[PDB]
Amino acid sequence: MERIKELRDLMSQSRTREILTKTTVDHIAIIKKYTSGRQEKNPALRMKWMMAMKYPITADKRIMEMIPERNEQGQTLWSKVMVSSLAVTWWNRNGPTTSTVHYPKVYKTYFEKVERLKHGTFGPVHFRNQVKIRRRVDVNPGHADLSAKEAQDVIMEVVFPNEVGARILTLTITKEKKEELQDCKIAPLMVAYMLERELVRKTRFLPVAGGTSSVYIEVLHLTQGTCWEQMYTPGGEVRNDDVDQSLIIAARNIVRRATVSTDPLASLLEMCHSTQIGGIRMVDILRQNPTEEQAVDICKAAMGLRISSSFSFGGFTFKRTSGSSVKKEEEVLTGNLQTLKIRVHEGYEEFTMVGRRATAILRKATRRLIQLIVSGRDEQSIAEAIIVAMVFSQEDCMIKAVRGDLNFVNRANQRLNPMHQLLRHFQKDAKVLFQNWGIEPIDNVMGMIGILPDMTPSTEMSLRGVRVSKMGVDEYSSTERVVVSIDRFLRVRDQRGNVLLSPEEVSETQGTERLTITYSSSMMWEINGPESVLVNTYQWVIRNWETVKIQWSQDPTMLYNKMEFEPFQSLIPKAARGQYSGFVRTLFQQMRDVVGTFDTVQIIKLLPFTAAPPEQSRMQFSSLTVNVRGSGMRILVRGNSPVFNYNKATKRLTVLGKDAGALGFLILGKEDKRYGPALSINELSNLAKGEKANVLIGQGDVVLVMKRKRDSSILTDSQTATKRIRM
C-alpha cells in the first residue's frame, strides 16, 4: 500500500486522471522531460552556501541504530531527515566493514584502463607540427563490438528479469552475469548503467595523430597536443581492433571462392546464412557491424544494405566530393595495334581517394588530371597510388604507355573490363609512364617535395599536378547510406550503372585467423584442413539425417549426386573411386533385399562414398582409403575404425578425436480470466508439461501464453517461397 495511495489521491484531481488515462507507456520518455527547469541558480554558489550551513545531507531514518548523534568529540551532525557532512567522514573511518570488496567485477571497464597504465611503458616526446588525421574510431575499449539495442536487451534481462522485453527467442553472458553476482547485488541502476558503459559500442569521427585502437584514444590527451606527441604503449589489445578482421578475411575468401560457382550470388547467400563467427552468425554481424571493406560491403549488399556511394578502384575506395559524370563512350588505340571501346567519363569532377596505406586528393576535367596530392607511408604505397592515379587520368599520355597484349582474366578465366586490365598490367611494372609524362619545375613551397620516375625525391621538379604531402592527407569518411543493385555476377551498380565494387581488388597478404570461424553451407572446405573436410562431411550427414532416412529410399541417385560431397570426392583417390561406388550401392541393394538385417551405424559408415559414378567392376572391398596431407588413412567396414569410431553406449560419433553428432512462448490474445490471475516471468513450476498462463510483459499489458511446438528457424522455408511463387 506504500505506493498506490499516491496514485489514488492523484486520481482524485480530474486533470490528473485524464493524463494518467490518455498517455501510454510508449510515451513515458516524452513526458518525464516536462520540468520547471529553473533551479539552476549557480550550483557553485548554492553548493558553497549549503556547505557552510550545517546538515545539507538527506539520509534515511535508519542512521539512528548505525551512527551516533555525538561524535568522538561531541559534534552535532543530526536534525529532526537532515545530516551534516562530518557523519560521512566518521562513517568513512569506522563502520560496518564488508567483504563486498569484490566490486572490481562490475567496474572492470575502469580497472582495465588502470592496468593499461600500470605496465604502460612510455617513450620520448619528439615534438613536431603534428598533422590531424580526420579518422573515425570507437570510444569504448574491449566491448566485443556490439550494437546498443542488442546489448541493452541483455542488460534489461540481467538486471530486471521480471520485466524483460518481448524478445524471447532462445550469449552465455546472461548465465555468467546471473551467476557471478546473483545475491551480491550492489546498486541496480548504477550496475546497469555501468554495464551499458562497458559493453555498448559507439564510434565517431575525430582527428587523431596515429592512434588506432580505443586504448590509444582514452589516453589521447597525453599523446596529442599542439606541436607535440608522446608514444605510449598500454601493453595490450582489445576486440574491436581484432574481431572484425576475422569477418573481413572470411568474406574476402568467400568472395574469392564464389566466382567459380555457377551463380555466385546464391552460393554466397547460403554461405553467409550458414557461416558462424565467434559463435555469432555472420548475417547479424553484417547487419550490425559498421566496418567498411569491399568484401564486407558486397556481402551486406547481397542482403540489401545501404553502403557508401564509392567508385572503388585500384584497391582504393573513392568518395564523391564534387562534379558530375557523363558516359561518353569512346574509341582507344593501344601500343600493339588493338582497338578498345571504353567509358570516358565526361564532365568535371573532383575526388578524394583513401587507400590502405595512403590517401590523395585529385581534380579531373574531361581527360584532364590536375592537383594530385598524395601522402603515404612506404615508397611502394605512393608508387601504387600514383600508378592507379595515372590510370584514372585517361589522358592519351598513359595511352601511349601500353606495352604488350592485354589478357588478364578472373580466377575462373573471365575477361575483365579494360580499366582493371590496365591496372594489373601496370602494377607489376609501370616505370615507363613517367619518362613519357612530362616534367614541370616546382618552387619547394609549403613542405611539398617532388618525386621522380626513379622513385627519388627532388626539390625543384616534379610530375604534372603531383604533390607529396607530409604525414598524411586529410581523410573524410562521408556518411551515405544508399541502395544498390547487385547482379548475379557479384558486380555492384547502385543507381547509375557505374561499376562500384568488383572481385578484382580483393586480395592482399596471407590471411591469419584470430577468431575461430566455421562454415557450414556449401563445399567451401577445400581451404580448411582435410580432417576438417572429413569431420564436416560426416557431421553434415548426421545433421540432415532425418531427410536422408527416406531420400536414401526413394530417388537415392540424386542423394548420391548431392553436390555437398564434391569436396569430399576429390579427397578419396581418383583411381579406385567408381569401384567403391558400385560396391557400396550393391551393398545398399543387398540391405534392401534382405530387410531387417542391417545396421544403421554401418549405413552412415559407408554412405558418403556414393558420389562417384559407379563402375560395376568384378571385385569387392573391406577397406577404403583417403589421402590427407600426404598420408593415407584407412576405414574398415565392420565395427569401429580409427577415423570412424562410434562408441557403443555413448551414442556419440567420433571422427579423428573430434566429436561428431549423436543419434520462449507465444501470444494467444488479451488477458482472459479463464486461466487464473496474472503472473511474473518465472516458470520453474509452470514449465511442467505445457501450461496456459496470463502474464505481464515488460512494462506493457497482460498477454496470454502457451507453449511452442515448432522451432521457427531462418532456414530455406523462406526460400521454399520461390517454389510456390514463380512456379
Binding site: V125, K149, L222, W228, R287, K670, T716, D717, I725
Partner: protein, 716 residues
C-alpha cells in the same frame, strides 16, 4: 522504418514488394508505411500457409519438416504474392473448378478443406471497426474474413477461427515482437496511416485559411498565390541572369581595394578635456596593510574579529579632518558615518553577547550615503496626468574624459614584486618522464616568478571583498552590515599574516534577480595624500585620519594617514566576476604557454627550457628615455598577469570594442612587417569605429597610448 524493414525481413518479400509497387509505380521512398504494411501482409499470409496440408481423408494436418512426399496440396492457395493479372487468372481457374461465385474484390488466400475464400487484414485501429468496415464493404456472399492486429487480438466470423490455436499464435507473436522492435526504434509513425481503411496515405499537411492567406501574402512582389510561386520555382531557368545584373549595377558599388603601406598607419587620436578619474572598485597601490602576523589557524577565522585587532594595532587616530570633498554634496555625512563606525566598533561588548556581525543603525547620514531614503514616486501614468515636471529622465551620454598620467604609474607599481607569497598552489602527483616533467618545469617556474606578485594581492583583495559582500547579502537580506576589506598573505619568514585595507557599509540586499543593484560605501586606508593629484579622485572624499610610524634606516618619519571614501554599486554577477578573478592567472599562463608552443613549433626538440634559463634572451618592454628598454622573463610574466588582472577589474565595454578593433590593425601591421603587401577597405571607417569606442576608461586610454607608441616604434 525503411532500413528496419530491410533488417527484419527476407529479400524475397522485398522483391515481391518491388513487383507489387511497380503494379502502380508506388515509389517505396515515399510510401514507407505502405512498404511496411505490404511486407507485413505478405509475411502474415506466408506464416498462415506454412505447415498446412490435407490428409487423404477429409481433414487437414500439419508437418514438422518440408518435403513433397506424395503430398503437395497446401490446404490453402496463395493469391497476393503474385502479379495482378496472373492472380486474377488463378482466382478464375479455381472458381470455375469449384463453381464458387468470384467476388469483385481481390482476395489474399483460398481455402481447400472448407472451400471458402479467406482474406487477411492487418491494421492498427480497433479490430471491431476494421471487421465491420470489411463486412459493410464485402457482404451478402459466403467469404470468410480474418483480421490480425499488432496487439495480438483475433477476430473471425461466427467464432470459426479457421485454424488450430498455436500455428496462428506464432503469427500473433511475430506481430507483437515486430511492434516492440519498431517501438524501441521509435517507429510507430504508421499509427495514423492505417487509420484510413486505405492503408497507404502519409501525413497530409494542408495549408488552409488564416495560414495560406499569409503564405500567398509571403511571396515576392510579382506573384499572387504561393501555388503559382511553387510552380515558378519548380520550373526554373538557370539561364545566367547574374552577368546581366552585374552589367546593370553601377561601377561605384564595388570593393575598391585600398593599399596598406608602412607610411599609411596614422597614430590614433585621443580625447581631450578633463583628466581620467578612477572608477576602480578598490585601491591598487595606495591602500595600506595592518600587519598582524596572527596564525589563528584559519578555523574559518571570523573576518570581523580578525579585524578588531587590526584596529587595536594602530595609535594616533587624529580627529577626522575633511580634506577633499565630493566637490558637490553634503560631505560631513561621511565623517559622521565614520565616527558612527567607530562607535558601533566600541558599542559591542555592552550588548551582553558578541554578535559575529554588527548591523549598523538606520542612521540618517548613512541613509543619505546609501540613498535608501533617496527614492522617487512610483506612480502610474494614468494618475500623474498633465504634470509640469513630467519630462523624461536626462539619460545623457557621458563626457570624454581625457587621459592623465597616473594610470601608467599605477600599472608600473602593479607589476613589482613584494615580500609576501599570497598563494597556496596545491600539490601535484609524481611527474612521469615524457611531459609531466616539462609541464612541471613550466608551471612551477612561472609560479616562483609570479607567486609573490602584487597583482596576486589585487586578485585576492577583489576575491575576499566581493565574497564577504555576497555571502552577507544572502543573509543580511533586510538590514545593514559591515564589510571588512581583508586580505591574507605569508611572511618572507613564512608566517600567516592578515592585512586589513578598510571598511565597507552595505545597503539593502533585497536581491530578487541577478542584475539587482545594491549600493555600498567604501573607506580604504592610505598614505597617499589626495592633495597631490586632486582630479584623479572625483568620486572620492578624503579624511585626514591620523599619523603612523614608518621605520627607516634612521628612525621613523611619521607620515600622515588618510581615508579615501566613495559610494558605488554592485550586484550578484558583478561580485561573482571577481570571486573567480584567479582566471586571470590561467589566461596569463596560456597566453604565455601559447608562445611556448607556436614560436617553438619549428623545432625537432621544442624550445621550452631555453625559453627560460637564458637571461641573454631579452624582451623589449619599455621606453622611458626615448630608448627601447629590454627586460627579462619574469617581468613579462607578471606583466601579462597584471594585464589580465586590470582588464578584469576595470572591465568596460569600451575595452572590449578597443580590443576587437586593435586586433585587426595589429594583425595588418604584423603582416606588413613580414613584407606580405597587405591592403585595406575603409581605413577612415576603422579609425571612426576606434574613436567611437573611446570615451572615458583610463585603462583603455593607456592601452591606446601604448599602441600609438608601438606603431611609432614598430619601425613603420
Amino acid at each position: 522504418m525503411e532500413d528496419f524493414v530491410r533488417q527484419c525481413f527476407n529479400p524475397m518479400i522485398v522483391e515481391l514488394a518491388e513487383k507489387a509497387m511497380k503494379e502502380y509505380g508506388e515509389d517505396p521512398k515515399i510510401e514507407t508505411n505502405k512498404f511496411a504494411a505490404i511486407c507485413t501482409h505478405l509475411e502474415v499470409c506466408f506464416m498462415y500457409s506454412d505447415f498446412h496440408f490435407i490428409d487423404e481423408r477429409g481433414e487437414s494436418i500439419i508437418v514438422e519438416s518440408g518435403d513433397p512426399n506424395a503430398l503437395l496440396k497446401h490446404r490453402f492457395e496463395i493469391i497476393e504474392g503474385r502479379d495482378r493479372t496472373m492472380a486474377w487468372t488463378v482466382v478464375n481457374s479455381i472458381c470455375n473448378t469449384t463453381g464458387a461465385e468470384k467476388p469483385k474484390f481481390l482476395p489474399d488466400l483460398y481455402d481447400y478443406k472448407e472451400n471458402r475464400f479467406i482474406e487477411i487484414g492487418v491494421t492498427r485501429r480497433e479490430v471491431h471497426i476494421y471487421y465491420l468496415e470489411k463486412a459493410n464493404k464485402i457482404k451478402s456472399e459466403k467469404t470468410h474474413i480474418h483480421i490480425f492486429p499488432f496487439t495480438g487480438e483475433e477476430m473471425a466470423t461466427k467464432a470459426d477461427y479457421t485454424l488450430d490455436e498455436e500455428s496462428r499464435a506464432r503469427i500473433k507473436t511475430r506481430l507483437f515482437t515486430i511492434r516492440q522492435e519498431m517501438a524501441s526504434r521509435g517507429l510507430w509513425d504508421s499509427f495514423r496511416q492505417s487509420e484510413r481503411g486505405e492503408e497507404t496515405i502519409e501525413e497530409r499537411f494542408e495549408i488552409t485559411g488564416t495560414m495560406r492567406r499569409l503564405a500567398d501574402q509571403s511571396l515576392p512582389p510579382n506573384f499572387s498565390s504561393l501555388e503559382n510561386f511553387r510552380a515558378y520555382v519548380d520550373g526554373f531557368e538557370p539561364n545566367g541572369c547574374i552577368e546581366g545584373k552585374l552589367s546593370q549595377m553601377s561601377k561605384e558599388v564595388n570593393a575598391r581595394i585600398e593599399p596598406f603601406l608602412k607610411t599609411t598607419p596614422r597614430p590614433l587620436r585621443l580625447p581631450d578635456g578633463p583628466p581620467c578619474s578612477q572608477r576602480s572598485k578598490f585601491l591598487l597601490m595606495d591602500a595600506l596593510k595592518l600587519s598582524i602576523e596572527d596564525p589563528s589557524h584559519e578555523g574559518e577565522g571570523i573576518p570581523l574579529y580578525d579585524a578588531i585587532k587590526c584596529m587595536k594595532t594602530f595609535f594616533g587616530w587624529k580627529e577626522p579632518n575633511i580634506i577633499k570633498p565630493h566637490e558637490k554634496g553634503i560631505n560631513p555625512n561621511y565623517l559622521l558615518a565614520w565616527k558612527q563606525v567607530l562607535a558601533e566598533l566600541q558599542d559591542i561588548e555592552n550588548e551582553e553577547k558578541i554578535p559575529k556581525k554588527k548591523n549598523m543603525k538606520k542612521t540618517s547620514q548613512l541613509k543619505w550615503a546609501l540613498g535608501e531614503n533617496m527614492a522617487p514616486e512610483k506612480v502610474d501614468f494614468e494618475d500623474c496626468k498633465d504634470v509640469s515636471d513630467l519630462k523624461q529622465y536626462d539619460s545623457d551620454e557621458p563626457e570624454p574624459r581625457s587621459l592623465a598620467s597616473w594610470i601608467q604609474s599605477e600599472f608600473n607599481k602593479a607589476c613589482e614584486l613584494t615580500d609576501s607569497s599570497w598563494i597556496e598552489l596545491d600539490e601535484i602527483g609524481e611527474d612521469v618522464a615524457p611531459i609531466e616533467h616539462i609541464a612541471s618545469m613550466r608551471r612551477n617556474y612561472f609560479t616562483a616568478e609570479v607567486s609573490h606578485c602584487r597583482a596576486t594581492e589585487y586578485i585576492m583583495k577583489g576575491v575576499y571583498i566581493n565574497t564577504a559582500l555576497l555571502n552577507a547579502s544572502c543573509a543580511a537580506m533586510d538590514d545593514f552590515q559591515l564589510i571588512p576589506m581583508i586580505s591574507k598573505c605569508r611572511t618572507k619568514e613564512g608566517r600567516r599574516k592578515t592585512n586589513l585595507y578598510g571598511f565597507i557599509i552595505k545597503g539593502r540586499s533585497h536581491l530578487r534577480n541577478d542584475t539587482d543593484v545594491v549600493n555600498f560605501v567604501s573607506m580604504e586606508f592610505s598614505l597617499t595624500d589626495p592633495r597631490l593629484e586632486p582630479h584623479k579622485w572625483e568620486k572620492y572624499c578624503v579624511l585626514e585620519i591620523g599619523d603612523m610610524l614608518l621605520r627607516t634606516a634612521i628612525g621613523q618619519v611619521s607620515r600622515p594617514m588618510f581615508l579615501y571614501v566613495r559610494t558605488n554599486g554592485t550586484s550578484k554577477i558583478k561580485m561573482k566576476w571577481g570571486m573567480e578573478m584567479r582566471r586571470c592567472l590561467l589566461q596569463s599562463l596560456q597566453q604565455i604557454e601559447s608562445m611556448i608552443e607556436a614560436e617553438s613549433s619549428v623545432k625537432e626538440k621544442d624550445m621550452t627550457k631555453e625559453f627560460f634559463e637564458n637571461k641573454s634572451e631579452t624582451w623589449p618592454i619599455g621606453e622611458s628615455p626615448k630608448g627601447v628598454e629590454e627586460g627579462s622573463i619574469g617581468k613579462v610574466c607578471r606583466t601579462l598577469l597584471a594585464k589580465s588582472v586590470f582588464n578584469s577589474l576595470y572591465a568596460s565595454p569600451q575595452l572590449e570594442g578597443f580590443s576587437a578593433e586593435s586586433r585587426r590593425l595589429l594583425l595588418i601591421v604584423q603582416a606588413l612587417r613580414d613584407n606580405l603587401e597587405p591592403g585595406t577597405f575603409d581605413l577612415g571607417g576603422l579609425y571612426e569605429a576606434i574613436e567611437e569606442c573611446l570615451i572615458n576608461d583610463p585603462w583603455v586610454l593607456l592601452n591606446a597610448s601604448w599602441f600609438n607608441s608601438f606603431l611609432t616604434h614598430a619601425l613603420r
